[PDB]
């Protein structure tokens, strides 16, 4: 079935942030047996491999923005691959890798499905522009490059000339926000972007959050869903092996709830599993805890249900 | 008071599963001071002691089902004792022991109160038949032996000739489900059993889960409540000394709220505190935590409330 | 603005309870950078230093009530300091110290604003009178001395002749309750005080709790809010370094939601951060975890929103 037909893409890239190890995200997600478990859940899994990311010598910074040609090139490569997966009538599954890869993952998806709606599950908005940013880490800027309403606010940054803004400010829902920069908060308010920060999650409950998110995107008519899951969206008690952990996250339950609900529409068209850094686990159990969580999230995106699952046969015979 | 007049039944039985230690459950629960805490809570506690489970050597498996004669006998002995306690006018308080014992606890209770409704708090449905089981562990099968609709789906199991299905599919509500086998999911959905898996708990909140659970069971008319409580229903962070732990469970708070709402109906007639395995705590602290949580749950069933409690006297005098 | 103008008062007092250390609370919270953090979120902060609590040797018990002259004098000195801060048009921020200091904090606040309402975040009611108390510890009795309806039930305790009940029973809302004494529960139900114990928070969700709390206190008319935050109101998994911890507490997110909702009214006028004891950490990390949770709740009271904040400037220029 279309909802369980998947194209796997390994994106072992870390240059959108300063912390080493996140490029090993595809390796540990694979080692934990992600592909085998998905196949055991009656999925049609095709593996497009791990993208080779060539080292860019003399990748000088654009103002304070670090590794601009490397980040741009890696997303350009990813955009090409995601579009090929989408042309094959499969759901693209990107195993990251830092969140700057969303530039390519979404751009690639929009090339085949321009009517796509984006759910962004993260502690962060990742919407700083190359000029509002204060760290110059591109993993905190991919939404700025993608938004149509920010065309003219993003300067010519090396490695990004291929990029065209493909999503309107009204086509994205944020779930999980708790660490947002002033410039990001300003953009969020001025562009009238829909979001459920942790305050909204506490207020309405994950049930009402998912009802409002799906009605906000699908209300008019069914349209393809791109879910960009940053594992720091969940609390560091579940996903500690991450680069930018923020206390008071979404529980293990809420995350499964979000992903089970998205599966049920049968409209998941693109997925990103981002920011798992296995070198950032204080103990070996902290890595395994994060990896296993990222696996459960992925499995729920393709049908694994807490109430149970069964083959369409008679088990009483 | 009726909802405070209790009769304790200790069931040191472990042969319904393969992990040693669960038989020590009634001892470690008594050693925590359970009886005393209940007395000090204005409860009429009468000790019916611990049941003597006579060892059955050469208990050859029935197909894949392990130690059937032992499990059949233990529950048979438990049914007589539970029925005796119920004839005395006391709430049966069964101390487990593995969940296979729910066979004898409910059948015994049903002999005195045939109209009873069951609230099953577990991570698991325990609804496999001696044929749909892959483990052959009878603690994962007690609901299949008790359901009327599955008469003809259960074969001649040695030790279970005394068993007569005492409840219909409509007379059971599940709360806390998160690890359901395909056979069990097929049973649950074809039998059309009411359930609240963790997905429904997240969607609704425990307030609505209980309002809906109790309305569905008690709406039509007042009826006896049998709460079968598997400590693995609660997340492993509150009850880690259990044989089959599953991540993302009911919190300590939801557990107390379930039992507080059941107390408040004044219709609790049977209680099972199952699967506390003191030999499975990863530290002596993990054992005491599971035991105190199990004690806390039990006290809430018989009136202990988080807002407080007082006697019918003027305290300002 | 009025909601970000603050007068910090240190109240290094411990004789309201037996465990040494709570007097270091103002020190450790200052050392965590509270003053600096508040100024980074556009606050006008004045520090009135730590109150000298000149020793009162010869302070024998009044019945079973411990250190009454010390508890009385500390609250008398605090009341005068809080009123002086209130007269200066600043939100009084009392860093405790044990919760017995609420007598003085609220009496002093009431002196300038007699129309104030109280929000009491705690695991306990702190409503024992000198006659209902079993422990004789005054941190468990502050509310009794303040309620108009309890006048006549308060005996003549040495060091408390300055006290006049300043709040009515209908002007206090409790949140977080889970350990209430029999005498306390009797007072709570007989006076008809609005309370949301952990049972209500479970039933309703913190969103309804806050909506009902702010409507119940401000629905008739807008008046100044006094928030008295006992850190033990949160689960000991976030605030373990405290004198009287109780499991099943308010989560980290719930504490931020309560304070976020209170800040948004723009009526917060007095705040108490009580019961932080840096000697009671089982590990140095449990101490830092407690102070940081206390600091986070505080910044939330003075505007720090999880969704983010921005200045009224064009960040895109
Ligand atoms: O733009 C920035 O560098 C920062 N702004 C807010 C977060 N604190 C680190 C930030 C990035 C997080 C990216 B993320 O982990 O969400 O992929
Ligand atoms: O039939 C089985 O062995 C298995 N089926 C699903 C559960 N995972 C282990 C199972 C049993 C749980 C029993 B219980 O701990 O709930 O008492
Ligand atoms: O009267 C008492 O001592 C006890 N009554 C219930 C609580 N258990 C300890 C008590 C006080 C809590 C004070 B508190 O930490 O809230 O300031
Ligand atoms: Mn991100
Ligand atoms: Mn993030
Ligand atoms: Mn069970
Ligand atoms: Mn179970
Ligand atoms: Mn207190
Ligand atoms: Mn307290």
């Amino acid at each position: 079935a279309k909802s369980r037909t998947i194209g796997i893409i390994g994106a072992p890239f870390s240059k959108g942030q300063p912390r080493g190890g996140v490029e090993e995200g595809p390796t540990v997600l694979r080692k934990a047996g992600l592909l085998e478990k998905l196949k055991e859940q009656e999925c049609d899994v095709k593996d497009y491999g791990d993208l080779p990311f060539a080292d860019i010598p003399n990748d000088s910074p654009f103002q304070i923005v670090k590794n601009p040609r490397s980040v741009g090139k890696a997303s350009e490569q990813l955009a090409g691959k995601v579009a090929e997966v989408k042309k094959n009538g499969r759901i693209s599954l990107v195993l990251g890798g830092d969140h700057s890869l969303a530039i390519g993952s979404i751009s690639g998806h929009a090339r085949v499905h321009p009517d796509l709606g984006v759910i962004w599950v993260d502690a962060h908005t990742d919407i700083n522009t190359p000029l509002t940013t204060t760290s110059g880490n591109l993993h905190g800027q991919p939404v700025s490059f993608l938004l149509k309403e920010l065309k003219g606010k993003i300067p010519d940054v090396p490695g990004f000339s291929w990029v065209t803004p493909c999503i309107s400010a009204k086509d994205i829902v944020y779930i999980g926000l708790r660490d947002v920069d002033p410039g990001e908060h300003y953009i969020l308010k001025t562009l009238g972007i829909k979001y459920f920060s942790m305050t909204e999650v506490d207020r309405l409950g994950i049930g009402k959050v998912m009802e409002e998110t799906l009605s906000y995107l699908l209300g008019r008519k069914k349209r393809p869903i791109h879910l960009s899951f940053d594992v720091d969206g969940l609390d560091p008690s579940f996903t500690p092996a991450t680069g930018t952990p923020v206390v008071g996250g979404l529980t293990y339950r809420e995350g499964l709830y979000i992903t089970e609900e998205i599966y049920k529409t049968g409209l998941l068209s693109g997925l990103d599993i981002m920011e798992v850094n296995p070198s950032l686990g204080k103990t070996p159990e902290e890595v395994t805890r994060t990896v296993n969580t990222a696996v459960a999230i992925t499995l729920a995106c393709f049908g694994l249900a807490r109430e149970g699952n069964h083959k369409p046969i008679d088990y009483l015979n």
Side-chain angles (χ1 to χ4, degrees), chain A residues 13-23 66-67 71 97-100 136-140 242-244 275 277 280:
Chain A
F13 189 77
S14 76
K15 312 241 166 156
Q17 51 87 60
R19 306 187 83 173
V22 76
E23 77 285 348
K66 289 141 175 69
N67 320 294
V71 173
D98 75 73
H99 223 166
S100 72
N137 295 332
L138 277 147
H139 76 153
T242 198
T244 49
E275 296 290 359
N277 190 328
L280 292 186

Side-chain angles (χ1 to χ4, degrees), chain A residues 167-185:
Chain A
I167 51 133
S168 300
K170 48 263 216 292
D171 300 317
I172 179 155
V173 195
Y174 282 114
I175 304 162
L177 321 179
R178 52 191 190 280
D179 181 63
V180 179
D181 304 338
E184 289 190 296
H185 188 256

Side-chain angles (χ1 to χ4, degrees), chain A residues 279-310:
Chain A
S279 78
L280 292 186
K282 255 90 159 193
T283 65
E285 185 278 336
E286 278 179 53
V287 177
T288 62
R289 204 201 302 160
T290 306
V291 171
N292 288 356
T293 296
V295 166
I297 292 295
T298 312
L299 291 200
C301 283
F302 304 103
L304 203 68
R306 282 174 288 175
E307 68 159 84
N309 294 94
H310 71 258

Side-chain angles (χ1 to χ4, degrees), chain A residues 7 82 85-86 90-94 105-106 109 113 116-119 224-229 262 267-273 301-302:
Chain A
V82 171
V85 167
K86 291 312 301 165
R90 293 179 172 278
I91 303 167
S92 47
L93 170 45
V94 188
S105 182
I106 296 170
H109 190 180
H113 297 291
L116 46 20
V118 177
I119 299 164
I225 299 172
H226 182 106
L227 165 72
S228 203
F229 206 111
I262 290 152
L267 298 166
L268 182 80
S269 189
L271 182 50
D272 298 329
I273 305 306
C301 283
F302 304 103

